[PDB]
Each structure stands twice: as structure tokens, then as C-alpha cells.
Design a protein around this ligand. Structure first.
Ligand SMILES: CCN(CC)C(=O)c1ccc(Nc2nc(OCC3CCCCC3)c3[nH]cnc3n2)cc1
Length: 279
């Protein structure tokens, strides 16, 4: 409130409001996240302080953690646009495929890094994915909410998330970049789940061992069949469709890791193009 000249609200995330701000001494422009409650517990400050060492060029740098008074502010490197806006700005033509590829490759590297340190994101979405004028894309935030990108194990009530929930969300985002429609626009938990079911078929014990004994699994679920995958993401080529489907496996254990996804044939001719951004 003292050290930081608020320039503008850029929105609210799940655990607080985010401002573009200017550091009053250093002149640095930064993303200021105010966190909002019973005094700011011991646990959270420690966990958050771990994230100051989670540094990768595809992860939005956490610059500073300020616990002052009762209050907690997170200070981040500011990026100029999010992918949501950039997709809206690209609706008429679609993001060029080489750019889509580059972005996916980069995010998978950010995930591979975070995952090898046992940190998950758990709410990856187009509003969380941040781009600059140099052709880079970064993951933001590791601590009405949208369900479009929730993994089916989360919706089916598994308490113990794995790295595979991020692979799932990334898969949904990939598809969305490619088709310019959201893959699974659920407006509630069951709507989300049944939209997943309609496209990939109701999962069973064959494709997902252990599924029928999950907390919110119901034997009364409608049993839809898998839709053809070339129907789902035209005009994604065969390499991309193949990679997509390994990212969208029901069973989190069969779901491709970030690291293996980086080795997929889809990325053989990957490049880093520079987009046109209107700021
Ligand atoms: C359509 C106009 N907008 C505003 C919607 C933009 O395109 C836009 C958006 C964001 C940035 N920059 C930005 N945003 C963050 O967080 C944003 C929150 C993430 C969690 C969910 C809610 C939003 C950041 N965190 C760390 N560095 C950040 N940099 C620049 C321009």
C-alpha cells in the first residue's frame, strides 16, 4: 500500500486480486498479488517461500514475498498479455500452428521442471498462461471459478492429485488453441464431467482401472461411447492428435508425462516464432 503505486487492476484469481504496480523506489513494474481470513497461517508463508527458489524461464518469476501486518502480498514479474486475450485477438485466423507448437513445447518444459521438484499447478487455464513480445510463454501461480480444464480424477473426488492433472489441463488448452472453441465448457461439476464423457466415452474398469470405486463415481452414469478423435480436433495433424490423446487418457498413470511429451514426434520440427501482439 506504501511501496507500490497501483497502476491498474488486471483481475482476480482464485486466491486474490492482481494489480499491475510500479515499485516506488526501484521503478520496476511488477504484478502485485494481494492475498485475502484468520491472520495468515504459519504453513502458507513456508510453502510460499519454497516457490521463491522454483525458478525457470517458463515460470513467471516470483520476485518478492511480503508478509506485512496481518497481510500477504506476492510480487511477480509482469508479462504483457495472457493467452485468453491473445486467442480472442486471434479468433478470425487462429494462432499459426508453428506458434501453437512452440507454446506447447515451452509449457511442457515449465511443467517438466516443476514436476521434477514435485510441485503442481492444479489450476492451469488460459488466464494463467502469460506471453511476451519475444515469443515466450510462462506459467503463472503455484499456490465463478472455471472447470473447463479440470481433470476427471479431480471431478470424481480423488484427494491425492498427481502431476497428471496439469498434463490434462494442458491437453485441453492445446485443443482450444487448435480449434478456437473450448474443449469442455462445463458450467457445473456434473456438466463438466458429462461433457468429458460425451467426447471420450464413459470410462470403465477396462480403460481406467479403479475408476468405479472413486468417491463420486456413480454406477448410474450414462454410458456414452468414445467419439472419433479426428472429429474432436480438426485440423490437427496425426502427430498432434496422437500427442493430444496421450495427454487426455482417463487413467492418470497412463497419461503421458511432461518429460515424455517433450520427446514426442510432434515436436521434431519445433521452432520459436514471434507473434504479433497489440498491447
Ligand atoms: C484482456 C486484458 N488483460 C487483463 C485480463 C490482459 O490481457 C492481461 C492480463 C495479464 C497480464 N499480465 C499479468 N497478469 C498476471 O495475472 C493475471 C491473473 C492470473 C490469475 C487469474 C486472473 C488473472 C500476472 N501474474 C504475474 N504476472 C502477471 N502478469 C497482462 C495483460
Amino acid at each position: 500500500m506504501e511501496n507500490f503505486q497501483k497502476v491498474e487492476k488486471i483481475g482476480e484469481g482464485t486466491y486474490g486480486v492482481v494489480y499491475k504496480a510500479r515499485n516506488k523506489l526501484t521503478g520496476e513494474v511488477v504484478a502485485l498479488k494481494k492475498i485475502r481470513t484468520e491472520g495468515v497461517p504459519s504453513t502458507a508463508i513456508r510453502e510460499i517461500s519454497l516457490l521463491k527458489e522454483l525458478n525457470h524461464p517458463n515460470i513467471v518469476k516470483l520476485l518478492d514475498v511480503i508478509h506485512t501486518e496481518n497481510k500477504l502480498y506476492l510480487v511477480f514479474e509482469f508479462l504483457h498479455q495472457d493467452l485468453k486475450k491473445f486467442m480472442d485477438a486471434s479468433a478470425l485466423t487462429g494462432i499459426p500452428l508453428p506458434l501453437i507448437k512452440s507454446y506447447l513445447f515451452q509449457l511442457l518444459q515449465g511443467l517438466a521442471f516443476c514436476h521434477s521438484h514435485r510441485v503442481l499447478h492444479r489450476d492451469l487455464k488460459p488466464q494463467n498462461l502469460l506471453i511476451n513480445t519475444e515469443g515466450a510463454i510462462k506459467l503463472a501461480d503455484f499456490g465463478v471459478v472455471t472447470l473447463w480444464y479440470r481433470a476427471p480424477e479431480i471431478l470424481l473426488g480423488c484427494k491425492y492429485y498427481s502431476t497428471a492433472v496439469d498434463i490434462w489441463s494442458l491437453g485441453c488448452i492445446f485443443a482450444e488453441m487448435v480449434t478456437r472453441r473450448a474443449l469442455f465448457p462445463g458450467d457445473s461439476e456434473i456438466d463438466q464431467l458429462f461433457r468429458i464423457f460425451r467426447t471420450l466415452g464413459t470410462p470403465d474398469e477396462v480403460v481406467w482401472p479403479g475408476v468405479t470405486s472413486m468417491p463420486d463415481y456413480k454406477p448410474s452414469f450414462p454410458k456414452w461411447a468414445r467419439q472419433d478423435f479426428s472429429k474432436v480436433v480438426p485440423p490437427l495433424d496425426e502427430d498432434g492428435r496422437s500427442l493430444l490423446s496421450q495427454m487426455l487418457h482417463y487413467d492418470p498413470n497412463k497419461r503421458i508425462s511432461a518429460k515424455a511429451a517433450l520427446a514426442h514426434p510432434f515436436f521434431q520440427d519445433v521452432t520459436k516464432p514471434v507473434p504479433h501482439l497489440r498491447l
